[model samples]
Target chain A: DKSKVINSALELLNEVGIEGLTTRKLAQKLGVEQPTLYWHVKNKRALLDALAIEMLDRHHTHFSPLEGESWQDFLRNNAKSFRNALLSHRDGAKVHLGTRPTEKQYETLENQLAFLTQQGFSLENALYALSAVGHFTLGSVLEDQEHQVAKTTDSMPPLLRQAIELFDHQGAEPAFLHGLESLIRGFEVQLTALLQ
Target chain B: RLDKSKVINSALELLNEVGIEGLTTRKLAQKLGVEQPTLYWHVKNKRALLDALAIEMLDRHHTHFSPLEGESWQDFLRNNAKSFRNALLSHRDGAKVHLGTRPTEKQYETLENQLAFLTQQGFSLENALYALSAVGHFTLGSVLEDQEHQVAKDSMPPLLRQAIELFDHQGAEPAFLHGLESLIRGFEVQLTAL
Candidate 1:
């Protein structure tokens, strides 16, 4: 029954997106009382947390290090996977932003931490590197999704419009790739400085 | 007659309390001791009100991204990014509020000056523009992510908990700094190549 609730909520999420998926709407969609929906999940935040956990659980596997893969490739692949994971669901990026991890997702995070440490990053630097990539990916996707909804440039300032035009020539994917490469290259410099 | 500034001030104060989601025209009106229509009179709608609040946040800094003498472009950009992050962190969902708002005249001037500085430093218009976009996205996203984690840190999973503990010295601040420095360094590499 709990899984049923979660599954229905996710379906509603995909269909209507996050903003449209409220407890009241979910209840109506599920043909149950709103109180009945609350019985399984404590509140809206808790439900979103559950959805986020489910989303991350499905994608965290890609964070595992591959044999003979350079740290750069590993990080890049992990980022692509993470972004894809968020893009898979309606408002998934926002969900990832809003939800807290549960114990079920611990192993993947630990493996990621261990991988970065093995690559010679201080534990602190490893955390930052992972977060840097993760946050960048999330922010990129969030803005992309939001723009997809609004799809208008009438209100955008001239500078911002020009900025958007720069991306329009190449599209969001290439822009995301360029930023990621630049960010990773920057970290490589940091690693080099630390060794010297 | 309640002025636009009065309405914006009330909304900003209310933002700290109710957050982005909880803020409403009715509540804002009540807080201002005016009716909802009065708010409309001052600002066109909720989006306009939020834009005014965002502009106010940037306006509060006073310096407005003016480059300092003898300051490297990288340091100037870094300091600008930090100030932006600080401004966004001051209120709830502040990053969201700032993200889509149109840049007012003051903001447009500040940006023009910064772009001009970058061009003088030898960046192509394209490079300068991309660098700015990348840095802006990173700074805003970093704070939004950090703020989200902070609100729910205690309930995080064990592995994530350990990860958070690893940075107990300054929490997300160090991570943010590292990323910001890395991004600037990346831009420097581009500058060197050109």
Candidate 2:
């Protein structure tokens, strides 16, 4: 039933968004009483956190390094996969960023950190590298979500207005990929200098 | 006095305390020792209020970072990215406010100058636009994750217990600066260094 409510909440999330999402709305969607729903989700924050946990779990496979994958390629693949997960739902980045990480990700986080460390990243550097790409992915998705919102919106900035169509039609992929490449390459450079 | 300036100043303070969703006119009025209508006199609704808050947030933290003399495009871009990232991180739900609000005409004009400056520094309008946004979007994403990870909680059981301690105490700069510099260098090599 916990899975049931969380799944429905995600579906509703696409239609309504973070601000519009509510436990009451969730209960109504589930055709259940508020007290009954409260048994599963203590409050809106709890529901949001559950949404993040669920989404993260679904895409958790990407956190692991692919077989014989270079750390660099793994970062790129993982970040893109993370973005894919976040973009699947409305306000996905918001939900992901707003909630604290509970213990549902033990194996995933442990494996990711260890994988990077084994590939010659210090623990600190591994944390920084992974955290950076993930955050950058989050930031890009947040911008993309906003870009989608602003695509149909009206405004008076003539210059940006002209440029807005490219973003709307193509999304922020160009920028996202460009920035991500920059980050990933930078880490590789850092690792290189350390080894030298 | 219920003036716009004082209202915004206090609202930002309250935003820091209660966060974006928790910010309400009723609570704002109580904090200001004024009536609800008194608060509404300055702004009609939360959207208008959020717009004002976003403007104030930018003015105080985000705006005012023009490039310095003898600065490379990369250096200036790095600083600007820091200013933006810090601006969002300074307030609770700051990134949220930023994403939800529109740019002011003044801000738009500033962007025009920025694009022009980058063009002078060997960037085309479109490339410059994407380059600048890449840094910014990276910062936005970076700051959001850091903001959420503030507590001293450890990872799935004990795998990251040691790392969590460091993460809890390391502040937000190490990861951000590393990532920011990397992205800027990427632009230089991949986008600019042609």
Candidate 3:
């Protein structure tokens, strides 16, 4: 019965995407009533949270500490890892960003917060910074997903590229990522100045 | 007025007035004095109608984008960043609505212009791409966090006040923006004319 729940979830996820999921269909797919599935998972909200935890765990193993001597390098590597993880599945970042975590993600959150706190970030600052970084990563991956869905031109026009040069010259990225290192650099400088 | 364009326009109006959650074909049909079936004749459904509205928001105001031309890539990038934020701020839950949409539209002329400027200023393609994502993440993430706070602030503890105070202080002092400038300078140090 537990396998039945997981299997139905995977099917629903693949077919209709996260936005299309409903407890109603889950039961129908399992050839049982909705309340029976509720007995297993309690409610739709809990089921979604369970799916999130399962997905988060799949990529949590990839988060390794960076070797960079500077805080900037450490953050960059962290950002990259986070982006890669979200990119692994369809609408993964959107799902993670939208849903509030249940009891499951608290440990992972603690581990993440601990990592920054150990790096000398104050607990308050650490939480803020972590949330900021998490939002950035989730947001960027989401933008990428938006681009993919829009089917916007894969390449830009030379004339528009000329216009970009005429105005301000940044590369072909979505702009935020194009200028992210500088943002991190900004944070690094501020942190150092505060330390001093 | 009875076509998809009209339906989408009304949808946009609904978005500005209420939000994504408040929009429905039934209400729209009543407004148009037609059956909901007529809306299907134009937009097909709610989500499809929203796509048109989203595309319209990005393209409106042909000459007045906030991220308009600037003297430097950094300047232009900031302008673009601010513009994106302003765009979302214009409508209630604009970013949330955008989240559900990944429209395949011609939003690239703006992007191409930005990229061309970066390359001319001696940034690598990878660097330029990174810069773009950085602005987007900062802005989008900032907005999302802002919404998250609004949605769950009461549940949050008072300890968060310390963090907010710290950020507020730095924000008031332009300290964070200063960090951004230094980072841009660092990127400049790595630039090559080729």
Candidate 4:
């Protein structure tokens, strides 16, 4: 029953954003009574948290390193996967970032932290690296969508205006990759120095 | 018609209590002792209310958001990231408020000044743009995660329990600084090689 509700919730979530979602709307969409919905989800925060984990389950990958994958490549792939997962849904990054690492996922987290240790990252640095990468990814997807909300006129300058056009034409991916690469390189540099 | 400035102050204060999601026009009305229609006339909708709060959050920072004299481009960026982080965390769901930003007229001017600053320093327009944009997103993402929410479990795995303890508010702060430094340093490598 919970699984059924979460799947349907994601459906409605895609139709309207977190702002537009309500118990009534979801209940109406489900063809169920409000009491049935309330039995499963208590409020927005919990509902969104459940919603977030489900979204990731459907879309998120790269939680662990692939066989023989370098940490750098792993980091990059991991970041890309996380961003793509968030991008697959409405208000994806907001939902991802708003929730915390839950007890339900701790075993998976342990595998992640342990894998980085195999790659010579200290547990501490591993935590920092992963957190940074996730945050950057979430930030990129979240910021990327704001362009839709911008809905800037030309009480603007040429260079900045042209830059906006270029970025828009290319889409948010280039900027996101640029930043993602920067962060991954930083981690590599730091890891090497730690080795030395 | 109403003291619109007072409305923002009250709204922000109330934001601390209810969060961005729980924020409703009805409550804004009750808190301000005004009718819902009056709040509507001023704010139009939740989205508009958020836009106003977001701009107000940055109103002070826009002027101060620049490189310090003699600050290295990296250090300036690092500091800017930290300062923006401060600005975002100053209010509840600060990241959420900012997530929906459509820049005000003043933001465009402020941005140009930043691009010129970086270009003057050592960056070409494009490199500066990417780096600057990267830092903005990183800080925002960091703030969004560094919220006040908590995850509690009574009986947990040893590592998980320790991690949960380690990751409570303080755990996140160090991670934020670590991630920020990495972004700055990463940009440095690209800048130095070029």
Best by TM-score: 4
Q: What is the C-alpha lDDT of each candidate?
A: 0.77, 0.77, 0.60, 0.79
Candidate 4's C-alpha runs over 4 A off are: A1-4, A39-43, A100-104, A149-154, A194-196, B1-5, B60-63, B150-162, B168-170
lDDT score, residue A54, model 2? 79
Measured over the true interface residues after superposition, the C-alpha RMSD of each candidate is 3.1, 2.6, 5.5, 1.7
Instruction: Please give, for residues B81-182, the per-residue lDDT of candidate 2 as tens digits.
Output: 888876887788777778767777787777766776788887766678787787877787776666655533322445487577776688778878877877
Instruction: Identify the runs in model 1 with alpha carbons over 4 angstroms from their true place.
Output: A1-7, A58-61, A152-162, A194-196, B1-5, B62-66, B152-163, B190-194
Q: What does the i-RMS of model 3 come to?
A: 5.5
Question: How many pairs of residues collide in model 2?
Answer: 1
The TM-score of candidate 2 is 0.88
- Where model 3 places Cα greater than 4 Å from the true spot, the runs are A1-4, A62-81, A102-128, A146-156, A159-184, A191-196, B1-9, B16-18, B59-70, B100-106, B154-161, B164-194
DockQ of the two-chain complex in candidate 3: 0.32
**True-vs-predicted CA distance for residue A71, candidate 4, Å:** 0.8
Candidate 2 residues A21-101, lDDT tens each?
999999999989999999999999899888988777787457778788988888888888888878878888878776765
lDDT of 1 by residue, A38-134 (tens): 8888777887888887776676557677888888999898889888888878888877776655554456777777877777777777778888888
Residue range with the least summed lDDT across 10 consecutive positions in model 3 chain B:
B171-180
Model 3 lDDT per residue over B83-103, tens place: 666666556666676565643
In model 4, the Cα lDDT at residue A118 comes to: 74
Q: Model 2: which residue pairs collide?
A: A139-B141
lDDT of 4 by residue, A1-196 (tens): 8888888888888889877878788889998998888889887778888888877777777777887998788888888877778888788776776576675467777877778777787777787888888778888888886665565435587668867877877889988888888888788787788462
Evaluate model 1: give its TM-score: 0.86
Per-model DockQ against the true two-chain complex: 0.47, 0.58, 0.32, 0.62
Error of 4 at A1 (Å): 4.8
